[PDB]
Design a protein around this ligand. Structure first.
Ligand code: RBF
Ligand code: BNG
Ligand code: BNG
Length: 166
């Protein structure tokens, strides 16, 4: 009903901006990697309303979260770029032909893509963010792998329990 779903998007993006405050490192070595469940409202909006909408909410979520945490411009752009890639790919697989089999085929792939996109991103980001040589990224490599694999893997299954609980 247009005005119905636009506020649905509005409050869901605001929901995701709030849970982004419960972020924790989970990895003491790679402390900059912080997990929040703020990609689960996006993954739900992306399934109902479309991939482009799901990437819209993580874009505005982080913009809001950046306006309130105006100090991590690189660590929020990384989150958005990776988050937009996760919900966009997952929404596309479940789109076209709506099916439960594709809904898990998409979350398996979207978890694997975002993880690969993060490693390729941090290869030329971690050296510059810490003003350090490329070997520091190699020290951080298995933690970036396990993190985004677990982060989007958890977001995938937790969204699945909700999608199956109806
Ligand atoms: C150098 C750096 C690397 C990051 N890498 C990832 C990542 O690989 N996967 C991810 O989900 N989030 C990543 N983040 C997301 C991070 O939790 C978010 O941007 C926080 O708000 C950091 O300020 C990264 C952040 C920074 C600063
Ligand atoms: C319109 C139908 C959609 C289904 C209803 C589910 C509502 C939200 C999805 O789950 C929950 O969202 C919270 C807020 O972000 C998270 O804190 C929590 O971890 C997660 O479990
Ligand atoms: C083996 C000898 C040399 C090759 C090492 C591999 C590549 C490392 C590059 O170092 C550079 O150092 C700067 C400051 O130290 C960083 O700001 C910069 O991001 C980084 O690009």
């Amino acid at each position: 009903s247009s005005i119905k779903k636009i506020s649905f998007v509005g409050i869901f993006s605001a929901l995701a901006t709030l849970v982004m405050f419960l972020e924790f490192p989970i990895f003491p070595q790679a402390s900059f990697l912080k997990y929040d469940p703020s990609e689960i409202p996006a993954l739900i909006v992306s399934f109902l309303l479309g991939p482009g909408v799901g990437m819209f909410v993580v874009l505005v979520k982080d913009i809001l979260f950046f306006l309130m945490k105006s100090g991590d411009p690189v660590g929020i752009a990384m989150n958005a770029v990776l988050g937009m890639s996760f919900v966009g790919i997952a929404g596309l697989i479940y789109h076209r032909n709506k099916s439960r089999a594709t809904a898990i085929k998409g979350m398996i792939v979207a978890t694997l893509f975002a993880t690969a996109f993060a490693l390729g991103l941090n290869a030329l980001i971690v050296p510059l963010y810490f003003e350090a040589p490329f070997e520091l990224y190699l020290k951080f490599f298995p933690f970036i792998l396990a993190f985004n694999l677990v982060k989007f893997g958890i977001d995938s299954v937790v969204t699945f329990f909700v999608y199956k609980k109806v």
